[PDB]
Structure formats: structure tokens, C-alpha cells
Design a protein around this motif. Structure first.
Motif, PDB file in Angstrom:
ATOM      1  N   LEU A 153     -10.035 -24.440 -52.090  1.00  0.00           N
ATOM      2  CA  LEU A 153      -8.826 -24.478 -51.645  1.00  0.00           C
ATOM      3  C   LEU A 153      -8.535 -23.547 -50.237  1.00  0.00           C
ATOM      4  O   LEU A 153      -7.740 -22.679 -50.351  1.00  0.00           O
ATOM      5  CB  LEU A 153      -7.655 -24.175 -52.803  1.00  0.00           C
ATOM      6  CG  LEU A 153      -7.364 -24.774 -53.937  1.00  0.00           C
ATOM      7  CD1 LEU A 153      -8.082 -26.346 -53.469  1.00  0.00           C
ATOM      8  CD2 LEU A 153      -7.930 -24.368 -55.082  1.00  0.00           C
ATOM      9  N   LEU A 190     -13.594 -23.367 -55.616  1.00  0.00           N
ATOM     10  CA  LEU A 190     -12.625 -24.271 -55.896  1.00  0.00           C
ATOM     11  C   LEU A 190     -12.224 -25.130 -54.764  1.00  0.00           C
ATOM     12  O   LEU A 190     -12.253 -26.452 -54.972  1.00  0.00           O
ATOM     13  CB  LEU A 190     -11.237 -23.268 -56.199  1.00  0.00           C
ATOM     14  CG  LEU A 190     -10.954 -23.084 -57.698  1.00  0.00           C
ATOM     15  CD1 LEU A 190     -12.077 -22.771 -58.522  1.00  0.00           C
ATOM     16  CD2 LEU A 190     -10.026 -22.198 -57.658  1.00  0.00           C
ATOM     17  N   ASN A 214      -8.865 -31.031 -56.647  1.00  0.00           N
ATOM     18  CA  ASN A 214     -10.018 -29.962 -56.740  1.00  0.00           C
ATOM     19  C   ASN A 214      -9.355 -28.982 -57.890  1.00  0.00           C
ATOM     20  O   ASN A 214     -10.357 -28.353 -58.358  1.00  0.00           O
ATOM     21  CB  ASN A 214      -9.949 -28.947 -55.589  1.00  0.00           C
ATOM     22  CG  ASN A 214     -10.640 -29.854 -54.425  1.00  0.00           C
ATOM     23  OD1 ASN A 214     -11.345 -30.886 -54.581  1.00  0.00           O
ATOM     24  ND2 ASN A 214     -10.537 -29.420 -53.004  1.00  0.00           N
ATOM     25  N   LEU A 215      -8.032 -28.952 -58.097  1.00  0.00           N
ATOM     26  CA  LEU A 215      -7.655 -28.114 -59.367  1.00  0.00           C
ATOM     27  C   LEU A 215      -7.850 -28.600 -60.725  1.00  0.00           C
ATOM     28  O   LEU A 215      -7.661 -27.940 -61.652  1.00  0.00           O
ATOM     29  CB  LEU A 215      -6.345 -27.691 -58.906  1.00  0.00           C
ATOM     30  CG  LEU A 215      -6.027 -26.236 -58.061  1.00  0.00           C
ATOM     31  CD1 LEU A 215      -4.862 -25.998 -57.679  1.00  0.00           C
ATOM     32  CD2 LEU A 215      -6.948 -25.054 -58.840  1.00  0.00           C
ATOM     33  N   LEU A 240     -12.340 -30.365 -61.502  1.00  0.00           N
ATOM     34  CA  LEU A 240     -12.577 -28.879 -61.638  1.00  0.00           C
ATOM     35  C   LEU A 240     -13.284 -28.564 -63.162  1.00  0.00           C
ATOM     36  O   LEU A 240     -12.716 -28.923 -64.116  1.00  0.00           O
ATOM     37  CB  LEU A 240     -11.382 -28.137 -61.668  1.00  0.00           C
ATOM     38  CG  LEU A 240     -11.315 -26.595 -61.986  1.00  0.00           C
ATOM     39  CD1 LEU A 240     -10.462 -25.831 -61.047  1.00  0.00           C
ATOM     40  CD2 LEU A 240     -10.804 -26.327 -63.432  1.00  0.00           C
ATOM     41  N   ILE A 245      -2.667 -20.962 -60.226  1.00  0.00           N
ATOM     42  CA  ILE A 245      -2.436 -21.279 -59.035  1.00  0.00           C
ATOM     43  C   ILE A 245      -1.494 -22.503 -58.776  1.00  0.00           C
ATOM     44  O   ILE A 245      -0.680 -22.428 -57.830  1.00  0.00           O
ATOM     45  CB  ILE A 245      -3.941 -21.890 -58.561  1.00  0.00           C
ATOM     46  CG1 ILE A 245      -5.003 -20.647 -58.451  1.00  0.00           C
ATOM     47  CG2 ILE A 245      -4.081 -22.615 -57.354  1.00  0.00           C
ATOM     48  CD1 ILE A 245      -6.023 -21.269 -58.134  1.00  0.00           C
ATOM     49  N   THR A 266       0.522 -33.257 -60.870  1.00  0.00           N
ATOM     50  CA  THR A 266      -0.126 -32.633 -61.749  1.00  0.00           C
ATOM     51  C   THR A 266      -0.252 -33.146 -63.247  1.00  0.00           C
ATOM     52  O   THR A 266      -1.157 -33.134 -63.749  1.00  0.00           O
ATOM     53  CB  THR A 266       0.860 -31.277 -61.897  1.00  0.00           C
ATOM     54  OG1 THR A 266       0.932 -30.498 -60.782  1.00  0.00           O
ATOM     55  CG2 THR A 266       0.016 -30.298 -63.035  1.00  0.00           C
ATOM     56  N   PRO A 310      -6.225 -22.312 -63.037  1.00  0.00           N
ATOM     57  CA  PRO A 310      -5.490 -23.519 -62.329  1.00  0.00           C
ATOM     58  C   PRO A 310      -3.953 -23.615 -62.412  1.00  0.00           C
ATOM     59  O   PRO A 310      -3.347 -23.782 -61.769  1.00  0.00           O
ATOM     60  CB  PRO A 310      -6.255 -24.603 -62.996  1.00  0.00           C
ATOM     61  CG  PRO A 310      -7.415 -24.142 -63.349  1.00  0.00           C
ATOM     62  CD  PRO A 310      -7.246 -22.636 -63.799  1.00  0.00           C
ATOM     63  N   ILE A 369      -8.449 -16.804 -54.449  1.00  0.00           N
ATOM     64  CA  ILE A 369      -8.640 -17.931 -54.554  1.00  0.00           C
ATOM     65  C   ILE A 369     -10.333 -18.355 -54.066  1.00  0.00           C
ATOM     66  O   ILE A 369     -10.594 -18.224 -52.898  1.00  0.00           O
ATOM     67  CB  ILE A 369      -8.037 -19.182 -53.640  1.00  0.00           C
ATOM     68  CG1 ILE A 369      -6.374 -19.090 -54.257  1.00  0.00           C
ATOM     69  CG2 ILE A 369      -8.429 -20.553 -53.833  1.00  0.00           C
ATOM     70  CD1 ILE A 369      -5.465 -18.235 -53.554  1.00  0.00           C
TER      71      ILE A 369
END
Length: 368
Positions: A362, A360, A18-19, A23, A40, A64, A37, A356
Motif C-alpha cells: 500500500l 502489504l 491488496n487488503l 491478502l 487500515i 469492502t 486490515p 504499513i
């Protein structure tokens, strides 16, 4: 609120999907707070560091990096996606430095931000990986830019007659180029890309314009006239005006146009006497002998009542230019990329004040 984000080890691929993976960079919350992002992502790292979970830190940082790379393989020819993830990767890298505990990076941090530093893990290894990644993204960004600008350059700078009387569709003009430069610059600003990085990107873009325009001049006899020199010199003045309008006169972008400028002036100045020869040899300090001689040979007189440049005049130029051990370069390498630097750019954003947005997705993320 300490500025940390808690998640469960099973939701990690969801945290990353999602990030990062899907996104949209044109998203509202992301365009309101760039680059969200990265902030976060780091607040999640802070929690794992606080939890002293070495396995969680590894898995997060790996996912990541691998996610960012995967995005660049699916949407790698899209300027906005690449610009966004260059900006966020840097911000992530900047966060990893700014809140690393190493005092050399927290010289512009509020006292509150200093409470946000890592205590358990030294992530210097991962910082170099991210730094290497940012370089790859930059090169891809430049490549995408070059690919977009390239078909516009010849048409807009040379083939379309701008000012006059001063004496898949190739339809672009100077204005087409200036609009494209506007899109590039504004997008980068929207993404919160570092000022020093935007400057290098702009310097690179100006190089492409200069190189490609000069090359066509050196390849096309019909472009080597007094009028064309006047047109080029006018077009460049509009490029320079654009730099002032964006406050980018310190980017070095202007200096990259110097060979083109000198060639344009070479097309205009007198080319007959010894004094004219000496003037040319003093004016063209950014052009090689091969380039100067080539332009003088290509030069087309306005009509039959102006003589061509004589060989004696050209030989006179060559004689005066033997004082300098010169580069043999004729055509410029249009696809050359200047080495990029990523200086440390700390943020002022208070991490404990970030919300948040549900856009997004989350919800599993718990603020700590």
C-alpha cells in the motif's frame, strides 16, 4: 498523525485487492497485529469522512463488503481464510461502532481515540449490513468445522478402543480430535477473534461431537455395552480437560455433552430392580423417553452369563416417565446451528501508531 489514510479514487480497487482479495491470512504483519486490515480499512473511511466525500465513503464500504464476499466464494472451504475474515469483519464492525461518535460505544476509549470519531456520516445502515455479513461468515465457519470434524468423531470416540481393563482414511483416534480442536482454537486466537465468539464456536463444536457420538450409539447395538460406556465417559473427561486447559468452562460446551454422558452412564448402571429403575429415571434428565428406552433395548451384556434387560424393566421405566410430557426426539440433529451473538468489543489499539508494511503493498496510501 491523526490516524487517517489517504488514497486516490482510482487506486480504490487496488486498495481493496491488496487488503482483502489476496491478502494471505498467514502473513507475518497480519499475524503480529490482528486484525490489521480492518484497522487500515477504517482509517481510510475516516479520511473520506473527514473529506466529506459521500461518494468515496459509499464506494469504499461497498467495495469492502463485496470483496469480503468474493473471498468467501473462492476460499470458502478453507478454515483459516473464513476464520480470518470473520475476525476482521467483526473488528471492522467494532471500529464502525467504537468511532461512530455515538457516546454509547466510546466508554472504553482513550481521549486520543475519541478524536478519531466520525463527524460527517452516520453509517448505521452499513453497520447492519456488516452485521448480517458476519452472521453468514459464522455459519460458513461452523459448516467448514463440522465438515472437518465429522469423519473423526465416530472413529475417535467409538470405534477406537481407548482405555482398557478398567472393568479419505478412517484411522482417527481421540488424540486426532484433540489435535484438531487445538488447531481450530489456536488459529482463531492468532486472528484475534473475539473471546465471546470463540466460546460460541467451541460450544458448537462440542455439540457436533456429542450429537454424532450419541446418534451412532442409538444406531449401533454393538456400541451399547458396559465397556463402551466406560470408554465414552473417559473420552468426555479428556474433552472437558481440554476446556479447562483453554479456560473455556464458561462456554456452555460442557453442557452440550450431557445427553451423551447420561447415555454412557446408562450403559453402566444396574438395570434389574425397581430401585435401579428409579435411579435411571432420576439420572437421565437430559435424555428423552425414546432415547432412554432405545439404549436399554440396544444394551448388549458382556457375555452369555449376564441376562439382557427385561421388557418388564423397560415397561417399569416407561411407567415412571409418564409424569413428564416428553419430546419424541430420538436421533439428534447433528447439523443444528445455535444462534450467534456479536456483542460490541472495542479495541485499545492506537490508530495513529500503526505502520504499513511493504509486504502489504500500500505505497499509494499516504498517512494523514
Amino acid at each position: 498523525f491523526q490516524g487517517m489514510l489517504e488514497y486516490k479514487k482510482e487506486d480504490e480497487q487496488k486498495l481493496v485487492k491488496n487488503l482483502i482479495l489476496e491478502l494471505k491470512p498467514r502473513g507475518v504483519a497480519v499475524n503480529l497485529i490482528p486484525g490489521l486490515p480492518a484497522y487500515i480499512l477504517f482509517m481510510c473511511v475516516r479520511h473520506a469522512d473527514y473529506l466529506n466525500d459521500d461518494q468515496k465513503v459509499r464506494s469504499l464500504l461497498t467495495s469492502t463488503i463485496n470483496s469480503i464476499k468474493k473471498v468467501l466464494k473462492k476460499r470458502g472451504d478453507d478454515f483459516e481464510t473464513v476464520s480470518f475474515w470473520l475476525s476482521n469483519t467483526c473488528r471492522f464492525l467494532h471500529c464502525l461502532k467504537q468511532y461512530s461518535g455515538e457516546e454509547g460505544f466510546m466508554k472504553h476509549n482513550t481521549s486520543r481515540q475519541n478524536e478519531h470519531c466520525l463527524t460527517n456520516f452516520d453509517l448505521a445502515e452499513y453497520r447492519q449490513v456488516l452485521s448480517d455479513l458476519a452472521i453468514q461468515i459464522y455459519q460458513q465457519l461452523v459448516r467448514v468445522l463440522e465438515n472437518i470434524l465429522q469423519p473423526m468423531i465416530v472413529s475417535g470416540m467409538l470405534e477406537h478402543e481407548t482405555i482398557q481393563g478398567v472393568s479419505d482414511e478412517g484411522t482417527y483416534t481421540l488424540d486426532s480430535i484433540l489435535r484438531q480442536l487445538n488447531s481450530f482454537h489456536s488459529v482463531m486466537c492468532q486472528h484475534g477473534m473475539d473471546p465471546e465468539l470463540i466460546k460460541q464456536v467451541v460450544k458448537q463444536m462440542f455439540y457436533i461431537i456429542g450429537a454424532i457420538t450419541l446418534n451412532n450409539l442409538l444406531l449401533r447395538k454393538d456400541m451399547c455395552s458396559w465397556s463402551k460406556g466406560m470408554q465414552i465417559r473417559y473420552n468426555v473427561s479428556q474433552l472437558e480437560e481440554w476446556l479447562r486447559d483453554k479456560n473455556l468452562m464458561n462456554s456452555g460446551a460442557k453442557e452440550t455433552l450431557e445427553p451423551l454422558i447420561q447415555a454412557a452412564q446408562l450403559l453402566q448402571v444396574k438395570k434389574k430392580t425397581d430401585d435401579d429403575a428409579e435411579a435411571i429415571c432420576s439420572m437421565c434428565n437430559a435424555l428423552t423417553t425414546a432415547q432412554i428406552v432405545k439404549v436399554l433395548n440396544l444394551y448388549t451384556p458382556v457375555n452369555e452369563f449376564e441376562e439382557r434387560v427385561s421388557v418388564s424393566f423397560i415397561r417399569t421405566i416407561q411407567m415412571r416417565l409418564r409424569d413428564r410430557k416428553d419430546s419424541p426426539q430420538l436421533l439428534m440433529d447433528a447439523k443444528h446451528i445455535f444462534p450467534v451473538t456479536f456483542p460490541f468489543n472495542p479495541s485499545s489499539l492506537a490508530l495513529e501508531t500503526i505502520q504499513i508494511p511493504a509486504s502489504l503493498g500500500l505505497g499509494f496510501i499516504s498517512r494523514v
